[PDB]
């Protein structure tokens, strides 16, 4: 279909791309996966003129970096000069699927220059850094080292090429600022994955999205003691040839806080081939989830398990940002609706959000052991009965059904039956809270009245620990457990890009997102009638909290009212949607941004035609 | 072969057997398994005249007891009378493989009688019980209740049968004492599974087995504040028609401390059919143990794993009683011998003894993760290479071997090789000690110098936690792990009967025991040349500590010097040895003891012929 | 969705249904499966008032009939009377999923009445039967026996119920004719599964469907010496309260040859639950078909197997009726188109049509053996390489790729490469023809030029024998092999109802049918834009032969030009189509027909509202 070599045929000639980022070969957050996945297509486009510049860490170097020798004489001269001038620079390959060249700069070996460099910055942009930050100073050192490397690389080159530099956060924006200060012949791009003030303002300050025009960013930046970081990010965004954000909602947020509209929006992608390695995996995972809920709810298995539906929400334990409270309120409302209308449906909701626990509680392990004992006893009696049936049927006689069971069988089954006696109700949490009084999820569960009662049509299971294949009572990793659920609910409030909903959608699982997140906006823009494809977009930007809860309840109830055929058709449509999130399609925006930067910095040699052409027409 | 109905054809007629024990339907220790396993053959012999009398516990009743109603009018009358006289008695069926009838007595519902009953005992045997014991008072209540039940059962019977009562410890000996006091028409048997003073004297007092004739049992019993318990046990043993012990060494110990030679010795048995459900299982378990030691010793896999031998010792964390110190010293000596003689053998020893830990350490999990990563990478590259080879071979061309590996393969293998880098040596313990300074095993390991060095020919792994199938890094239970080891070393010092060595032998694993344990004495008595069958008996009774360590080192070195064929033949001989430990053969001694009791109590109706008749020696004789 | 209890709420009261057919408990053809599958829903609707009347055969009775006694006194009286009057009648259960009551009549025990009954028929309808038919006489005896049974059942009934009789062919039409002759109080239905003259006229006579109005059925019936059978069928159809056919094309054919338009059309259905037990099964079956074509085409595997498509046609070896010649011509045209346009696609077509063979030929077995040898050698070398890689990677060293292969590996691979040498081209037939000169499929293959050449983009494999799981070289049954194919081509010319295309569609496989068959007409009527759902209907009724071949070539080329995503979407739409062919929906037409018969025969007690309501508009293919 639409591949990289579609219409962007550009005269790259002698051009060098430097992918500057603080998080290459050094796992910290989420852009690490972005760069690691994008390296393959970037190297396919640029060949060997692609370098990733990052800080030097011992752990990362010994784990995933293979040190080599500089392949070009100019690079070797640059490395030798910088190493002899009082620095420490390493070169190698990043042991990832693309195998790109990596330049690693040790910021701990250049403290002596800090007192000088900190002055020079002030003599250039009137930006000062407090001595006690301990994280911005690393950014200053990294930026000065990157500018030094770029200048030396341009000086040592026999024929000077057109250099394109791409900085990825405020941690790397000082290098861009200094590149523009020294008037180096480079083309600068700046990408923001989340505006700095956004996460500060979402928590504490009220109505962040309804006061984007009433925010005096100087005041909030200064009062929170992050004024220098805000100035760094805004200066980096201001003096860049091309400015970019990873989502539309981030584009509005940056246009109102960084005072610059992005020239282009480049969404985050991923490699879908590895995820694709969908009904066989779904069936197996659903069977295992059925076994787990059989074990957990032992002694209370009075509801049909062929009419039960498995919802889930996953991610970091952010109660408001991940929208767990809205999910809980909607679950209570859906429980009331299911009880009132006299339905046979049951809904088991899972909350996989890490918290501060110690171990499992006794009830959960007890239930798993009870289920294992019953399964073993049933298999033993079944095998014995099958052998007896075969033997009695080989002689041409109908089995006397009142003698296939004997004394030890009845003993085993009586012990098994005695095992499943319980007077209490299943717990809503599978672990032991260290802060059970101050936990918000459990507090809301208690407030709204979901105690896994027999009359309740909605059961809730809160599983703090991450899902691991070696766990005693969920011996399965995250992906295979998710493949067996029916729906994923991510009603995010503050979310520049949703990695978890995108991963869920790639696996072929219907999902609920919002228009306050990057993934939700992307899917809303690229699909007509997304609900037919299994994506439910919750209008959370133009609605109140109660209206959002009501709409979520409507979505959940309408999902519960589908037939099995409708659910199958919806899940097939969701499955045929993964190619929209691959770097084979989402990597074209990066190409367009680089072309814009090249044409802006060197208009004599390059010219750009603003082709912004880049899908799912169905129903509506 | 030799079954129950071999020569003991006895006129059982109207006889009732009561198997009195404190530990029926109530799991506490090890005789629970003895009674649970023996119930099947006992019920086959006695039919429905077999009752197990024990205390009433809520947990046991709700877990494994099915309450029923009395099947005979006499039993119903007895139960109703006792329940209306101020007691609480339950009747039921024990949910085990035999399914025997159980009479459960609630000792907490008869505290009001204690002040009376405690007096009556003194008016009968001059035995007092201090009020602060809290465990002997339960024994007194249980004994009085059992005597009450037996008396009422005899009173309510229309035709009086011959009752045989079998008491199993000092906790149940008060009932026997009171049965003999009231001159009831019953035949009493007393079985001791361990003499009370033995475990007290083994720890603290020196040379327990070399001073059995120099012990003034009254003094040691009194000084340890267990004089009343000692008097209870000795009185129960004294006034019994038949006295029994579970082993020969226990027989000498009881003859010298209880002042009565046992009339018979009844060893403990087990059901071998369940254990038999052993070369395929051994191969699979050995492969998994190889994988575990590959993971643990990552970055130091410089020794041949086809020449490595897996020893182990298991049981409760008793450093001296289980003989771990002798094992450690012998391991150090064997390490010196293996290094000096320039051998290619390696010995990995396992110490599975529970201790007080919290979690695994980082190194062990790191090694398991490294092994998993290497296995996954190798399988990925292998599958890719196999697909490419098949494709290139279907077109009739030899594979160009320099192009089957491409960039992402080399990336995966380089990452794995980077992962397998380590500068330190593997740990000797897989957990985090809470008392690492005061641990005796680790202290001795440090003292003798076994740090899993590269030059060391003996590696040591101490795994405190019990082996469980759900463990993160040993996902295997005890039986299936043990089935893959080469030898089990149990040089026990004080051990009335060895359940772990017997279980190991039933599975077909060669083992080392001593003549200071019941299992070792049994195997020494029943086998000629036990070492040919894979049982090495250590002479620990007539030797010093250093001589025992030297003999153990000799045994280990001689085992290490066998060829593979010799080891296979030895393990095959060990496999044909499980039927010696089954209740189908070991249940005949109980029958003989019951016959002796019946003939002693009622000589008019029964007479006993002292037939103490009860195949091994060698196979193919080389010399 | 639409179940049986939807809108036909009818007052059955006391009514008895008799499902008369010559083929109950006696497997002959295809209506056996129809009755066996329909019995479940029919019994659910009618309970125990449902009887199947059929001939008595020893094999069927001993295999699938369980003899019982009459459950009602009237039935017992009827059976006793008929058995004492000179007949032989059996009663029992049919051992099928519904378990319906079966009445079996022995036509061989009533030859004495033939000379009488044959006369009586002439005294009623002026129909004579030649003595040498030997199949119509059985029909006459069966019809007279069925009428006798119905009359006796009505005579012996204490309260007379409303009896509904359903006859299913000309073999059972004499009973209906005699029921109407004797004016019995019964409601008759007649179902025709194929008109008798149709199969005679399709072969030999030209342009059968373009001369339906120019056929003097008396002349063709008389000239073919089947005049008596034709008169039997036409008389049965004429004097029936309700007349039915199994398809629309059969409805026109009967309206023009039997001179009576059907009152209703009842299509054949099946139980889809058993077939459903679709991508995992498809993937596995496609892998096995890939392995088979790898074995067959050894030494010529120069084409991409990830771009090959598997077509097939199955059924009885009727060259013209099953439309094999059109398929072959379209295959040749598609081969020319694929070669001219320089495509990378390959098409392997399968012809599974039984013929008269002896055994496999040498080349096919040779290829299977070669493939097995290559697979074994590759697996051996792969396992050895994986073990060496793991061992060399556990020590932290990159594998020296030039030493992972040694002498015996190269020996095995050289032997395999020598084994894969061939100079000739793969055969088009997997067996040894006994009539290779007179075979039409091979003659047409030779004429059109499909010799499995290297340049040919269409390979052809003709496999006469039925697919069996125990075959040496296709060890798989029909269903699993079909599940792996991409398309099924059934361009039938004469086909009253297509069991094979319907079975293929139930499994979820896109198919090509025609409007000259019952299944094709049904799917055309019930679906809007069937090609979006994977059903390609070929206009063969209003087109010539060459136009049909051109349209089939267009269909095949358009299928070959789809992307993988389009093929996946089409196959999903085909999968969501099986519920249209189930008896849960197709059983309602039988209910409507029975209601019409009851209302026509007994208008006083029953009345029928002519409700003929019984739909797949495309999902989202933007139009």
Coordinates of N, CA, C and O in Angstrom, one line a residue, chain B residues 429-496:
Chain B
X429 N 24.3 -20.0 48.6 CA 22.9 -20.0 49.1 C 22.0 -19.2 48.1 O 22.5 -18.1 47.6
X430 N 20.8 -19.7 47.9 CA 19.9 -19.1 46.9 C 19.0 -18.1 47.5 O 18.1 -17.5 46.8
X431 N 19.1 -17.8 48.8 CA 18.1 -16.9 49.5 C 18.9 -15.9 50.3 O 20.2 -15.8 50.2
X432 N 18.2 -15.0 51.0 CA 18.8 -14.0 51.9 C 18.6 -14.5 53.3 O 17.5 -14.4 53.9
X433 N 19.7 -14.9 54.0 CA 19.6 -15.3 55.4 C 19.2 -14.1 56.3 O 19.7 -13.0 56.1
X434 N 18.4 -14.3 57.2 CA 18.1 -13.4 58.3 C 19.1 -13.6 59.5 O 19.1 -12.8 60.4
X435 N 19.9 -14.7 59.5 CA 20.8 -14.9 60.5 C 22.1 -15.4 59.9 O 22.7 -16.4 60.4
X436 N 22.6 -14.8 58.9 CA 23.8 -15.2 58.1 C 25.0 -15.4 59.0 O 25.9 -16.2 58.7
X437 N 25.1 -14.6 60.1 CA 26.2 -14.7 61.0 C 26.1 -16.0 61.9 O 27.2 -16.6 62.2
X438 N 24.9 -16.4 62.2 CA 24.7 -17.5 63.1 C 24.3 -18.8 62.4 O 23.8 -19.7 63.1
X439 N 24.3 -18.8 61.1 CA 23.9 -20.1 60.4 C 25.0 -21.1 60.5 O 26.2 -20.8 60.2
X440 N 24.8 -22.3 60.9 CA 25.8 -23.3 61.0 C 26.3 -23.9 59.7 O 27.5 -24.1 59.5
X441 N 25.4 -24.1 58.7 CA 25.8 -24.6 57.4 C 26.7 -23.6 56.7 O 27.8 -24.0 56.2
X442 N 26.4 -22.3 56.7 CA 27.2 -21.3 56.1 C 28.5 -21.1 56.8 O 29.6 -20.9 56.2
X443 N 28.5 -21.2 58.1 CA 29.7 -21.1 58.9 C 30.7 -22.2 58.6 O 31.9 -22.0 58.4
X444 N 30.2 -23.5 58.5 CA 31.0 -24.6 58.2 C 31.5 -24.5 56.7 O 32.7 -24.9 56.5
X445 N 30.7 -24.0 55.8 CA 31.1 -23.9 54.4 C 32.2 -22.9 54.4 O 33.2 -23.1 53.6
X446 N 32.1 -21.7 55.1 CA 33.2 -20.8 55.1 C 34.5 -21.3 55.7 O 35.6 -21.1 55.3
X447 N 34.3 -22.1 56.8 CA 35.5 -22.6 57.5 C 36.2 -23.6 56.6 O 37.5 -23.6 56.6
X448 N 35.5 -24.5 56.0 CA 36.2 -25.6 55.2 C 36.6 -25.1 53.8 O 37.5 -25.8 53.2
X449 N 36.1 -24.0 53.3 CA 36.6 -23.4 52.1 C 36.0 -23.9 50.8 O 36.7 -24.4 49.9
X450 N 34.7 -23.8 50.7 CA 33.9 -24.2 49.5 C 33.2 -22.9 49.1 O 32.0 -22.6 49.5
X451 N 33.8 -22.1 48.2 CA 33.2 -20.9 47.7 C 32.8 -21.0 46.2 O 32.7 -19.9 45.6
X452 N 32.6 -22.2 45.7 CA 32.2 -22.4 44.3 C 33.3 -21.8 43.3 O 33.0 -21.3 42.3
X453 N 34.6 -21.9 43.7 CA 35.6 -21.4 42.9 C 35.8 -22.2 41.7 O 35.2 -23.3 41.5
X454 N 36.5 -21.7 40.7 CA 36.8 -22.4 39.4 C 37.6 -23.7 39.7 O 37.3 -24.7 39.0
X455 N 38.6 -23.6 40.6 CA 39.4 -24.8 40.8 C 38.7 -25.8 41.7 O 39.1 -27.0 41.7
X456 N 37.6 -25.4 42.4 CA 36.9 -26.4 43.3 C 36.2 -27.4 42.4 O 35.5 -27.1 41.5
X457 N 36.4 -28.7 42.8 CA 35.7 -29.8 42.1 C 34.4 -30.1 42.8 O 33.7 -31.0 42.4
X458 N 34.0 -29.4 43.9 CA 32.8 -29.6 44.6 C 32.1 -28.3 44.7 O 32.6 -27.4 45.4
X459 N 30.9 -28.2 44.1 CA 30.1 -27.0 44.3 C 29.0 -27.3 45.3 O 28.5 -28.4 45.4
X460 N 28.5 -26.3 46.0 CA 27.6 -26.5 47.1 C 26.4 -25.4 46.8 O 26.7 -24.3 46.6
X461 N 25.2 -25.9 46.9 CA 24.0 -25.0 46.8 C 23.1 -25.3 48.0 O 22.7 -26.4 48.2
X462 N 22.9 -24.3 48.8 CA 22.0 -24.4 50.0 C 20.7 -23.7 49.6 O 20.7 -22.4 49.4
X463 N 19.6 -24.4 49.6 CA 18.3 -23.9 49.2 C 17.3 -24.1 50.4 O 16.7 -25.2 50.5
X464 N 17.1 -23.1 51.2 CA 16.3 -23.3 52.4 C 14.9 -23.6 52.2 O 14.4 -24.7 52.7
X465 N 14.2 -22.8 51.4 CA 12.7 -23.0 51.2 C 12.4 -24.5 50.7 O 13.3 -25.1 50.1
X466 N 11.2 -24.9 51.1 CA 10.8 -26.2 50.5 C 10.6 -26.1 49.0 O 10.3 -25.1 48.5
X467 N 10.9 -27.2 48.4 CA 10.7 -27.3 46.9 C 9.2 -27.3 46.5 O 8.5 -28.2 47.0
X468 N 8.8 -26.4 45.7 CA 7.4 -26.2 45.3 C 7.4 -26.1 43.8 O 8.2 -25.5 43.2
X469 N 6.3 -26.6 43.2 CA 6.1 -26.5 41.8 C 5.8 -25.1 41.3 O 6.0 -24.8 40.1
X470 N 5.5 -24.2 42.2 CA 5.2 -22.8 41.8 C 6.3 -21.8 42.1 O 6.1 -20.6 42.0
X471 N 7.5 -22.3 42.5 CA 8.6 -21.5 42.8 C 9.1 -20.8 41.6 O 9.0 -21.4 40.5
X472 N 9.5 -19.5 41.7 CA 10.0 -18.8 40.5 C 11.2 -19.5 39.8 O 11.3 -19.5 38.6
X473 N 12.1 -20.1 40.6 CA 13.3 -20.6 40.0 C 13.6 -22.1 40.2 O 14.6 -22.6 39.7
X474 N 12.8 -22.8 41.0 CA 12.7 -24.2 41.0 C 11.2 -24.6 40.8 O 10.5 -24.9 41.8
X475 N 10.6 -24.5 39.6 CA 9.2 -24.9 39.4 C 9.1 -26.4 39.4 O 8.6 -27.0 38.3
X476 N 9.4 -27.1 40.5 CA 9.3 -28.5 40.5 C 9.1 -28.9 42.0 O 9.7 -28.3 42.9
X477 N 8.3 -30.0 42.2 CA 8.1 -30.4 43.6 C 9.2 -31.3 44.0 O 10.2 -31.6 43.3
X478 N 9.2 -31.8 45.3 CA 10.3 -32.5 45.9 C 10.5 -33.8 45.2 O 11.7 -34.2 44.9
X479 N 9.5 -34.6 44.9 CA 9.6 -36.0 44.4 C 10.3 -35.9 43.1 O 11.3 -36.7 42.8
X480 N 9.9 -35.1 42.2 CA 10.4 -35.1 40.8 C 11.8 -34.5 40.7 O 12.5 -34.9 39.8
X481 N 12.1 -33.6 41.6 CA 13.5 -33.2 41.7 C 14.4 -34.3 42.2 O 15.5 -34.5 41.7
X482 N 14.0 -35.0 43.3 CA 14.8 -36.0 43.9 C 15.0 -37.2 42.9 O 16.1 -37.8 42.9
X483 N 14.0 -37.4 42.0 CA 14.2 -38.5 41.1 C 15.3 -38.3 40.1 O 15.7 -39.2 39.4
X484 N 15.9 -37.1 40.0 CA 17.0 -36.8 39.1 C 18.3 -36.7 39.7 O 19.3 -36.6 39.0
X485 N 18.5 -36.9 41.0 CA 19.8 -36.8 41.7 C 20.4 -38.2 41.6 O 19.8 -39.2 41.3
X486 N 21.7 -38.2 41.8 CA 22.5 -39.5 41.7 C 22.6 -40.2 43.1 O 22.6 -41.5 43.1
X487 N 22.6 -39.5 44.2 CA 22.8 -40.2 45.5 C 22.2 -39.3 46.6 O 22.2 -38.0 46.4
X488 N 21.7 -39.9 47.6 CA 21.2 -39.1 48.8 C 22.0 -39.5 50.0 O 22.1 -40.7 50.3
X489 N 22.5 -38.5 50.7 CA 23.3 -38.7 51.9 C 22.6 -38.3 53.1 O 22.3 -37.1 53.3
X490 N 22.2 -39.2 54.0 CA 21.5 -39.0 55.2 C 22.3 -39.7 56.3 O 21.9 -40.7 56.8
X491 N 23.4 -39.1 56.8 CA 24.2 -39.6 57.9 C 23.7 -39.3 59.2 O 24.3 -38.5 60.0
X492 N 22.5 -39.8 59.5 CA 21.7 -39.4 60.7 C 22.4 -39.9 62.0 O 22.9 -41.0 62.0
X493 N 22.3 -39.1 63.1 CA 22.8 -39.5 64.4 C 21.7 -40.0 65.3 O 21.7 -41.1 65.8
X494 N 20.7 -39.2 65.5 CA 19.5 -39.5 66.2 C 18.3 -39.5 65.3 O 17.9 -38.5 64.8
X495 N 17.8 -40.7 65.0 CA 16.7 -40.8 64.0 C 16.0 -42.2 64.2 O 16.4 -43.2 63.7
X496 N 14.9 -42.2 65.0 CA 14.2 -43.5 65.3 C 13.8 -44.2 64.1 O 13.8 -45.4 64.0

